[PDB]
Design a protein around this ligand. Sequence first.
Ligand SMILES: CCCCCCCCCC(=O)CC(=O)N[C@H]1CCOC1=O
Ligand SMILES: CCCCCCCCCC(=O)CC(=O)N[C@H]1CCOC1=O
Lengths: 163, 163
Amino acid sequence: FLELERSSGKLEWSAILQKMASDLGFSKILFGLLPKDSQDYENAFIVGNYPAAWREHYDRAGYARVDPTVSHCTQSVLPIFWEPSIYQTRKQHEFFEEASAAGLVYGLTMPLHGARGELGALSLSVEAENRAEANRFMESVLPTLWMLKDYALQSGAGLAFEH
Amino acid sequence: FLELERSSGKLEWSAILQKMASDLGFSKILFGLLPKDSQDYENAFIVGNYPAAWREHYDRAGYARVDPTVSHCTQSVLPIFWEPSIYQTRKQHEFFEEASAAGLVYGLTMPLHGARGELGALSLSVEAENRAEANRFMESVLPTLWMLKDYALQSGAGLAFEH
Ligand SMILES: CCCCCCCCCC(=O)CC(=O)N[C@H]1CCOC1=O
Ligand SMILES: CCCCCCCCCC(=O)CC(=O)N[C@H]1CCOC1=O
């Protein structure tokens, strides 16, 4: 958090957050944030290293309104693990297949709810060999991730919306 | 949390939360919560085992508007540890003397910000023979309490405000 706060500009903050994620064992991350009373998902503040073509398609196709992790974030402060049980409807299943082709198979999303009403998500994806190991690994680092998401929120909200 | 969610009503929920905090080494706790855009601190939803005479005095004297932990919660998602340095104004020093006489010297407050705009605090106080010891006790459980505060928020917001 101290490095994140000493950092200047989005490239540096993004680089620090991405390295924190990678050092913890997660090769892909997304931090997304909106100001209070905005549902403008396609124009959120977005940081991270999701493949660019996936990000562009996701926004163009309005996947924020289909992706079950986003609806979850609007309702909860608790993590959502990317298990098959969350990809229930045909459209969510098709979304899962496309996300999988983009390299996003195993992971979790931590909802973000800031002190000024900011709404966001911190997602991390892990390239584990199988689902069981992905889950054992994520559980083992979950307390660290839980702290990380609040530090990223407090710092990122300042970068996204403060002058 | 499943424990928190399976419970019936406020007395049971309070007992579960208090036991979880006690297991982490905290003998005094306060969980306070307000619905979106209400700062009526004297009418918050309050759970825990602060001395009743302190709670009554605190509300009567309007200490929510003096206590630096409360203003911190309105501004941040990060913990505030209790220590002389957070008490900066003359009024805050007077508050600190009274809080200390009530036994509330070593501890911390975790701000709560829920998905529906709920604003709250989970405060946790530890008994210790000195500050160095209090710090060892708190640091050793910080990642676990960081999860706990969000489970308590998600369950407590429903209990407090929803039919
Ligand atoms: C809660 C609203 C935040 C602002 C909008 C963020 C949009 C992007 C969110 C996102 O990509 C969630 C996520 O990581 N989804 C995973 C699930 C599997 O494939 C993904 O892309
Ligand atoms: C953020 C608003 C929550 C709703 C109002 C809660 C009122 C009580 C808050 C409180 O007691 C904070 C706290 O634990 N203060 C400590 C600090 C030392 O002595 C205290 O009483």
